[PDB]
Design a protein around this ligand. Structure first.
Ligand SMILES: [Zn+2]
Ligand SMILES: [Zn+2]
Lengths: 39, 36
């Protein structure tokens, strides 16, 4: 609906977070990219 | 020759289709395994 997640595809996320590369991630997959540090 | 440029924006094994090739890159780097 909102956007296409690259890790799960869950569009029912409370908010979307964009990665530094410019990708669109959710509150889950997006958080991983932040906490993990790496890609 | 060949194709070079990918005209497909939907993974076959995964089954998840995208609307933006830019994000598809991240998809194919996680969903279809953490390949590089
Ligand atoms: Zn997600
Ligand atoms: Zn895929």
């Amino acid at each position: 609906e909102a956007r296409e997640c690259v890790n799960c595809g869950a569009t029912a996320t409370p908010l979307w977070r964009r990665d530094r590369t410019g990708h669109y991630l959710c509150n889950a997959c997006g958080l991983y990219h932040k906490m993990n540090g790496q890609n | 020759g060949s194709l070079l440029k990918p005209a497909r924006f939907m993974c076959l094994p995964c089954g998840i289709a995208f609307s933006s090739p830019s994000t598809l890159e991240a998809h194919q780097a996680y969903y279809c395994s953490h390949r590089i």
